[PDB]
């Protein structure tokens, strides 16, 4: 296989029901690398086509310093495997869950330095007619700590009528109801949302009464003091009209973010 042949395993980092995630060296080249391997799916099926759309979005994706750098994906077996730069700081989720533990989290100017970052990384993704639809904590990697956008796996085009729903504690209302006009904007509505988390918060709903009043642009209490114009944008970036949030553009030029 040239996975075997080309790199040596030397860590599993992630699991799921799709792949498994390793740490690996590339022999020829030194470097480390997460590699993901995943069941090849069934040739022409809607499945494949979505393993291909994270393929090619990463294949567009690879100019921008917020947006986890590709640089090959191949086929063999009955497995799919991409090769990404290693990020070795772990995920966004991860550092959560510590920071959760000893009742520390990300202070302010750490979370406007995190909402920056990935706007950033979104206002390229966007600026490609490109909408990452799955963005939470798990799918933020961190490298001055970096933050880079990762798992394009529910990429899609902007203009795109039919769309994969990515992780319910982060989508927008919008989304769910099937109206797709606006789709840039349930990024913008997730990534508050991963900022909320950052700063504290509970894990968020998955449905229920506290799912859709949060829904409504009512921010899940956070245990810290944040300057009122922080919290105004964190609640006008979850407003329940989508044309009422910053485009990733209006965020990184926001003044609170000077
Ligand atoms: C599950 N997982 C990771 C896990 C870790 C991680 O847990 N490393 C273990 C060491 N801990 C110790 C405290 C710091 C982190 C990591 O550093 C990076 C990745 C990681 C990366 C990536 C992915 C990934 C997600 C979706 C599709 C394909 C990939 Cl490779 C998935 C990944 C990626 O693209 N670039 C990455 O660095
Ligand atoms: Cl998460």
């Known amino acids: 296989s040239r996975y075997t042949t080309e790199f040596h ?13 390793f740490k690996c060296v590339k022999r020829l080249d030194g470097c480390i690398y997460a590699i993901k391997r995943s069941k090849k799916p069934l040739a022409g099926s809607v499945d494949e086509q979505n393993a291909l759309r ?12 917020h947006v986890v750098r590709y640089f090959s994906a191949w ?3 009955d497995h799919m495997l991409i090769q990404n730069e290693y990020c070795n700081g772990g995920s ?15 202070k302010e100017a750490e979370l406007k330095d995190l909402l920056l970052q990935v706007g950033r990384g979104l206002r390229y993704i966007h600026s490609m007619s490109l909408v990452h639809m799955d963005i939470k904590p798990s799918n933020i990697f961190i490298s001055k700590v970096m933050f880079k956008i990762g798992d394009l796996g529910h990429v899609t085009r902007i203009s795109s009528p039919q769309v994969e729903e990515g992780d319910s504690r982060f989508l927008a209302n919008e989304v769910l109801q099937e ?3 606006h789709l840039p904007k349930a990024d913008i509505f997730a990534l508050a949302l991963t900022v909320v988390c ?61």
């Open 75 to 77: 086929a063999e077996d």
């Open 9 to 21: 395993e030397l860590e599993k980092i992630g699991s799921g029901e799709f792949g498994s995630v």
């Open 92 to 106: 966004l989720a991860d550092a959560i869950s510590e920071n959760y533990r000893i009742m520390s989290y990300f």
């Open 198 to 258: 950052a700063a504290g918060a509970e894990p968020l709903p998955r449905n229920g009464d506290q799912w859709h009043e949060i829904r409504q642009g009512r921010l899940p209490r956070i245990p810290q003091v944040l300057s009122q114009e922080f919290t105004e944008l964190l609640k006008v970036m979850i407003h329940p009209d989508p044309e009422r949030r910053p485009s990733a553009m209006a965020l990184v030029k926001h003044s609170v973010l000077l």
């Open 179 to 181: 109206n797709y006009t």
């Open 54 to 65: 994270e393929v090619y979005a990463h294949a567009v994706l690879g100019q921008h310093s």
